[PDB]
Amino acid sequence: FCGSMMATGKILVAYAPPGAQPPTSRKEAMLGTHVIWDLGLQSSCTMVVPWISNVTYRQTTQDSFTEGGYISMFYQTRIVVPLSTPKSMSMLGFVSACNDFSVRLLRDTTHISQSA
Amino acid sequence: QRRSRSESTIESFFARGACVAIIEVDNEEPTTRAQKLFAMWRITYKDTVQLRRKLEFFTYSRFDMELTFVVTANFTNTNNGHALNQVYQIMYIPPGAPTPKSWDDYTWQTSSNPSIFYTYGAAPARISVPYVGLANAYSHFYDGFAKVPLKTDANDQIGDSLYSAMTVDDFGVLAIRVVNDHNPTKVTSKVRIYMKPKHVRVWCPRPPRAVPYYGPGVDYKDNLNPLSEKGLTTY
Amino acid sequence: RVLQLTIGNSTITTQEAANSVVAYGRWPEFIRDDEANPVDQPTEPDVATCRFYTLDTVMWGKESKGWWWKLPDALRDMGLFGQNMYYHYLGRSGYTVHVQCNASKFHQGALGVFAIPEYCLAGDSDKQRYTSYANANPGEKGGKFYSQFNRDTAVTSPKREFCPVDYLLGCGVLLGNAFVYPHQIINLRTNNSATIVLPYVNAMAIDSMVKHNNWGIAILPLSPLDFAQESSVEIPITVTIAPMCSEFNGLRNVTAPKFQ
Amino acid sequence: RVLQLTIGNSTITTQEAANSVVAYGRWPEFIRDDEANPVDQPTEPDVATCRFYTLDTVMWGKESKGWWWKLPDALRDMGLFGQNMYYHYLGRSGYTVHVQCNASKFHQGALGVFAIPEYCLAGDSDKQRYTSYANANPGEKGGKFYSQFNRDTAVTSPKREFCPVDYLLGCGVLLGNAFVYPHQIINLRTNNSATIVLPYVNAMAIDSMVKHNNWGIAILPLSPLDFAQESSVEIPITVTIAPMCSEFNGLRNVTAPKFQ
């Protein structure tokens, strides 16, 4: 969270394993694994998405048999901003991998094209 | 006692290697028709019948592989002009990799995908593939779906799927082309892929198919009368 | 010797007790991994919820052909097991299918109770593997076999449903070859019950239950029923399933698939 | 020092962490009977189902008076806890009510979060103890307090619903005497959170949950909210409840009471 110092609020970030509809409102998205993230004390959360899967290895293609999950972020409470403070904040999101991530079966890529 | 039961073991029952496909690939002047300058083959075992009906005694299995490529050639004219010895490029493509579209794309650079150059006339190619499954065993006869249609869907096609299928594209393709540039004389090639499983472990036996196959499913349309005519009390 | 077969709160007694086939020789248990680094515990309804649920009662007439169910497709209607199966992403179970079918001393005939793992049936239309969801999961009401293969001709409204044939068993095998499955024969001469303990057979260690169906039960009358001299005679068949040693994992929002 | 308060799968972090009132000094646990002769085990959803469920968000304006909920009345809408509470005849639980309410440095005011055991409110009509079921259990949407006691006069259609008064707290006590309950004060000067662990307080060892409601939560704005100089200002309040150490017993068929 890279807003001003005086801005506060709470954000609910949630994860849901596949099989159901993607969660639309907060009423059905608080059921899965979620982290209520505060904006006042710190300015950064850390949500470790666990490894729940029937198969040992998922795929790196758009497949429906091995679907990852869903990520959603709702307002727990509204952002509270005093006067003489900008109303439009900003947010940056990152990604990583823990020390148990692993891959196999090297193959080609699709992020290049040699226009000849 | 004193009978060798070694010929009937599972590792000895799958010792022979039967064909799985025959792929046409041609080398002619590029026409406006469907050019067979390169050909593709979806990797599956349920193309022939003798290997399919043999593997389907068993519900689950895990096994290595040993493929073998046997390549023949022909001419198309009676006293056709002579031609130099040709080089084939068999190329494996995992699921998700870019598929070739012309004879000579950027994807035939084989920079990640394993590929086999086979000079015509020599000994056949002979490569091994380990257990490339992602579950603990290959699953013959998957029962369920891939997708489940929900009540909250917009239309029918979103939750639509295909009965008894785990993935649309299993194990990718082979992509066989001829490396030499095309000629006014054309040489028809027919690659035959053999397949010999190794280190076979199987589970959960089931009875074999006894009406002829029809498609990659488990259904049937024709010849629903396998047993012949024979009297009741006649020896 | 009379089996006071009790699991959970319900109790299955008997008038005759002969045998109880354990399929493939393995009693069901939980996941046994000695190389498990996480020690956190999943959601197990195993404290009082191994109960005997009872399906519909079908009537075995003189010209009836067969019945078939799926598992855990048949348990999605009733029980609190039917609710845990929807909130949880993946889970495993083991079953005890108990089929009772009483008759007098003057009736005859013999059923055959099978339990086919991965029981893929056959469609009817020439479109291959072309079957809707609601027609491929009829639920606890089951489905019935047929005499001859009659494929559908309605092309603008395709039926998109199965048409299994009894002596082909639906799959394509013969029926005399179908005794390599774990089975039981309700011979109305001697016994009137059939209990089969089913372990968890699947390739994965744990797999989803909404889309996949592990076991398939098929009841075939191997010999036709006959009372004294009449031509109309109906005795009932009742099936009873108990989920043993279930466990679940990974909650999410509820999923209600459409069943038209 | 920043509380990484994690129960189940969800996680409650904070920007400020001060205290956590355990009501009456006892952390919740199961039934501890050393003189127990039956060793059979009830149905405990305790393997992964201690989660933080989140109620509705109410808006605390400048002239808003109060809110009140009941427990386990508020949890019957969502969760798999809402399904176990209907199939089982009797069960016990313990709660952690967590109330967050953020504000800037220029707002002021202070809430007060109570947890009244056996919170009997007062009806409005002169018919004594004359309150319908659906009006006495509003669910997770809660109810609001009032300024003056306005009894109902419609006699052919009686409302049959509560009318609590805020400084009488509904019951009949004063508000300054209401700090003998286990409480917490969300003073917007210093902190912005309030967590209260509630043990199982009831006369029986285990009691029904459809008809009885053990705890009652009441949020009273002790000082009115005020922003800089305006007369319209609304900040949100969000309540979060986690059922800890629940257990249930005695399955039956499902019960759906009417809520008009």
Closest by CA position to C55, among listed C41, C39, C72, C43: C72
Q: Which residues have CB under 8 Å from C213's CB, separation 6+? A: B143, B144, C70, C71, C72, C73, C119, C137
- Contact between chains at A31 and C210 (C-beta distance less than 8 A): no
Q: Which residues have CB under 8 Å from C24's CB, separation 6+? A: B204, C182, C199, C201
Distance (Å) of CA C162 to CA B148, C126, C151, C168: 18, 12, 10, 13
Environment class of B111 (CB within 10 Å of its CB; exposed 0-12, middle 13-18, buried 19+):
exposed
Q: How far is the C-alpha of D83 from the C-alpha of D76, rounded, in Å? A: 8
Tokens of D177: 């005497």
How many domains would you assign to chain D?
A: 1
Q: Which residues have CB under 8 Å from D53's CB, separation 6+? A: A30, A31, D75, D78, D79, D81, D240, D241, D242, D243
Q: Which of B219, B221, B227, B228 to mutate to test the interface with C (most CBs of C within 10 A)?
A: B219
Q: How far is the C-alpha of B9 from the C-alpha of B2, rounded, in Å? A: 17
The amino acid that residue B199 corresponds to is H
Please report the residues numbered 22 through 61 in chain A whose beta carbons come closer than 8 angstroms to any beta carbon of chain D: 26-28, 30-42, 45
Environment class of A86 (CB within 10 Å of its CB; exposed 0-12, middle 13-18, buried 19+):
exposed
Distance (Å) of CA C118 to CA B169, C200, C202, C214, C247: 21, 12, 9, 5, 20
Tokens of D253: 């068929």
- Residue C8 contacts residue C2 (beta carbons within 8 Å): no
Tokens 């999605």 correspond to C76
Distance (Å) of CA B146 to CA A59, A87, C210, C215: 14, 45, 10, 18
Is the bond leading into B94 cis (omega within 30 degrees of zero)? no
Q: How far is the C-alpha of C88 from the C-alpha of C71, rounded, in Å? A: 17
Distance (Å) of CA B96 to CA A18, A67, A74, A110: 21, 15, 33, 8
Closest by CA position to D28, among listed D50, D10, D11: D50
For residue D49, report the phi and psi dihedrals to the nearest 5 degrees: -110, 40
Q: How far is the C-alpha of D124 from the C-alpha of D130, rounded, in Å? A: 9
Tokens of B196: 């010999």
Task: Report CA Rg, chain D.
Answer: 19
What SS3 class is residue B20?
strand
DSSP 8-state class, residue B207: P
Produce one character per residue of D11-50: b if its CB has 16 or more CB atoms within 10 Å, e if not.
bbbbbebeeebbbeeeebeeeeeeeeeeeeebbbbbbbbb
What SS3 class is residue C95?
strand
Q: How far is CA D1 from the centre of its chain?
A: 27
Q: How far is the C-alpha of B121 from the C-alpha of D71, rounded, in Å? A: 83
The CB-side HSE value for D226 (13 A sphere, CA atoms) comes to 8
DSSP 8-state class, residue C162: B
The amino acid that residue C208 corresponds to is S
- Residue D3 contacts residue D14 (beta carbons within 8 Å): yes
DSSP 8-state class, residue D81: H
Residue B2 marked as a ligand binder = no
Q: How far is the C-alpha of D220 from the C-alpha of C150, rounded, in Å? A: 73
Of C42, C47, C48, the CB nearest to D48: C42
The amino acid that residue D32 corresponds to is R
Nearest CA distance, A49 vs chain C (angstrom): 12
Q: Which H helix or E strand runs over B21? A: strand B18-25
DSSP 8-state class, residue D222: E
- Determine contact: B113 vs chain A, CB below 8 A: yes
Pairing, β A33-38 against β A70-77: unpaired
D partners (3+ CB pairs within 8 A) are A, C
Q: How far is the C-alpha of C16 from the C-alpha of C2, rounded, in Å? A: 6
Q: How far is the C-alpha of C104 from the C-alpha of D146, rounded, in Å? A: 73
Q: Which residues of A touch B161 (CB under 8 A)?
A: 64
Kindly tell me whether chain D and chain B come into contact, counting contact as 3+ Cβ pairs under 8 Å.
no
DSSP 8-state class, residue B80: P
Tokens of D14: 């904070």
Chain C residue with CA closest to D41: the answer is: C47
- Residue D84 contacts residue D45 (beta carbons within 8 Å): yes
DSSP 8-state class, residue B7: T
- Residue C68 contacts residue C143 (beta carbons within 8 Å): yes
Neighbours of A90 (CB within 10 A): 8
Cα three-residue angle D101-D107-D113, rounded to 5 degrees? 35
Cα three-residue angle D174-D179-D181, rounded to 5 degrees? 110
Q: How far is the C-alpha of D246 from the C-alpha of D241, rounded, in Å? A: 13
Q: HEC string of D84-146?
A: HHHHEEEEEEEEEEEEECCCCCCCEEEEEEEEEECCCCCECCCCCCCCCHHHHCCHHHCEECE
Tokens of C131: 């079957």
Environment class of C259 (CB within 10 Å of its CB; exposed 0-12, middle 13-18, buried 19+):
middle
Breaks following residues of chain B (C-to-N distance > 2.5 Å): none
For residue B72, report the phi and psi dihedrals to the nearest 5 degrees: -115, 175
- Determine contact: D222 vs chain C, CB below 8 A: no
Q: How far is the C-alpha of C188 from the C-alpha of C57, rounded, in Å? A: 18
DSSP 8-state class, residue D53: E
Chain B interface residues facing chain C, Cβ-Cβ under 8 Å? 59-60, 135-153, 159, 161-165, 204-211, 214-221, 224, 226
Q: How far is the C-alpha of D153 from the C-alpha of D156, rounded, in Å? A: 9
Q: How far is the C-alpha of D60 from the C-alpha of D73, rounded, in Å? A: 22
Task: Report CA Rg, chain A.
Answer: 19
Where are the strands (E) in chain C, listed by range? 5-7, 10-12, 21-22, 53-60, 67-71, 88-100, 108-117, 143-144, 193-198, 215-226, 235-241, 243-251
Environment class of A23 (CB within 10 Å of its CB; exposed 0-12, middle 13-18, buried 19+):
buried
Q: Which H helix or E strand runs over C133? A: helix C133-136
Q: Which residues have CB under 8 Å from B34's CB, separation 6+? A: none
- Residue C19 contacts residue C197 (beta carbons within 8 Å): no
- Residue B204 contacts residue C201 (beta carbons within 8 Å): yes
Tokens of B133: 């499954």
The amino acid that residue C221 corresponds to is P
B partners (3+ CB pairs within 8 A) are A, C
Query: How far is the first Cα of chain C from the last one, in angstroms, to the nearest whole number?
Result: 48
Tokens of B168: 């649309």
- Determine contact: A68 vs chain C, CB below 8 A: no
Facing residues of D220 across strands? D112
DSSP 8-state class, residue C108: E
- Determine contact: C255 vs chain D, CB below 8 A: no
Q: How far is CA C150 from the centre of its chain?
A: 25
What SS3 class is residue C84?
helix
Q: How far is the C-alpha of C154 from the C-alpha of C159, rounded, in Å? A: 7
C partners (3+ CB pairs within 8 A) are A, B, D
The amino acid that residue D98 corresponds to is H
Q: How far is the C-alpha of A55 from the C-alpha of A51, rounded, in Å? A: 10
Q: HEC string of B34-73?
A: CCCCEEEEECCCCCCCHHHHHHCCEEEEECCEEEEEEEEE
Please tell me the total number of residues recorded for chain C in this structure.
260
D25 conformational bin, left if phi > 0, alpha if psi -120 to 50, beta if neither = left
Tokens of C246: 């279930």
Facing residues of C117 across strands? C215
Q: How far is the C-alpha of B168 from the C-alpha of D137, rounded, in Å? A: 51
- Contact between chains at D12 and A30 (C-beta distance less than 8 A): no
Q: Which residues have CB under 8 Å from D194's CB, separation 6+? A: D97, D98, D99, D100, D101, D111, D113, D184, D185, D186
- Determine contact: C210 vs chain B, CB below 8 A: yes
Neighbours of C107 (CB within 10 A): 15
Distance (Å) of CA B57 to CA B12, C178, D23: 15, 12, 65
- Contact between chains at A78 and D235 (C-beta distance less than 8 A): yes
- Contact between chains at B208 and C173 (C-beta distance less than 8 A): yes
Q: How far is the C-alpha of C230 from the C-alpha of A34, rounded, in Å? A: 67
Of D14, D235, D236, the CB nearest to A41: D14
Closest by CA position to B203, among listed B146, B129, B145, B136: B136
- Contact between chains at D102 and A27 (C-beta distance less than 8 A): no
Closest by CA position to B150, among listed C257, C209, A28, A21: C257
Closest by CA position to B54, among listed B10, B5, B21: B10
Q: How far is CA A67 from the centre of its chain?
A: 15
Handedness of CA C173, C174, C180, C186 (dihedral sign): positive
Nearest CA distance, D140 vs chain C (angstrom): 18
The amino acid that residue D55 corresponds to is L
- Residue B40 contacts residue B173 (beta carbons within 8 Å): yes
What SS3 class is residue D243?
strand
Tokens 């917009």 correspond to B154
Q: How far is the C-alpha of D214 from the C-alpha of D217, rounded, in Å? A: 10
- Determine contact: C133 vs chain B, CB below 8 A: yes
Q: How far is the C-alpha of B53 from the C-alpha of B74, rounded, in Å? A: 33
Residue B177 marked as a ligand binder = yes
Environment class of D136 (CB within 10 Å of its CB; exposed 0-12, middle 13-18, buried 19+):
middle
Q: In the structure, how many helices (H) and strands (E) does chain A have? A: 0, 3
Q: How far is the C-alpha of C84 from the C-alpha of C243, rounded, in Å? A: 12
Please report the residues numbered 138 through 197 in chain D whose beta carbons come closer than 8 angstroms to any beta carbon of chain C: none
- Contact between chains at D104 and A81 (C-beta distance less than 8 A): yes
Neighbours of A17 (CB within 10 A): 24
Alpha helices in chain B (DSSP H): 10-13, 50-55
Facing residues of C243 across strands? C95
Identify the CATH number of the domain in which residue D95 sits. 2.60.120.20
- Contact between chains at C252 and A32 (C-beta distance less than 8 A): yes
The CB-side HSE value for B104 (13 A sphere, CA atoms) comes to 7
Of A60, A64, A107, the CB nearest to B147: A64
- Residue C44 contacts residue D47 (beta carbons within 8 Å): yes
Tokens of D142: 């809660």
Handedness of CA C29, C34, C39, C40 (dihedral sign): negative
Tokens of D112: 């007060």
Closest by CA position to C218, among listed C248, C242, C190, C196: C196
What SS3 class is residue A28?
helix
Residue B192 marked as a ligand binder = yes
- Determine contact: A10 vs chain D, CB below 8 A: yes
Give 3-state DSSP helix, strand, coil % of chain C, rounded to 5. Answer: 5, 35, 60
CATH topology classification for B1-235: Jelly Rolls (2.60.120)
Strands in A10-16's sheet, in edge-to-edge order, are: A70-77, A10-16, A33-38, D10-12, D5-7
- Residue C250 contacts residue A52 (beta carbons within 8 Å): yes
Q: How far is the C-alpha of D54 from the C-alpha of D98, rounded, in Å? A: 9
Q: How far is the C-alpha of B226 from the C-alpha of B211, rounded, in Å? A: 7
Closest by CA position to D61, among listed D99, D105, D107: D107
Q: How far is the C-alpha of A25 from the C-alpha of B89, rounded, in Å? A: 54
Please tell me the total number of residues recorded for chain D in this structure.
260
- For residue D229, the enclosing domain spans 1-260
- Residue B71 contacts residue B191 (beta carbons within 8 Å): yes
Tokens of A63: 């497949």
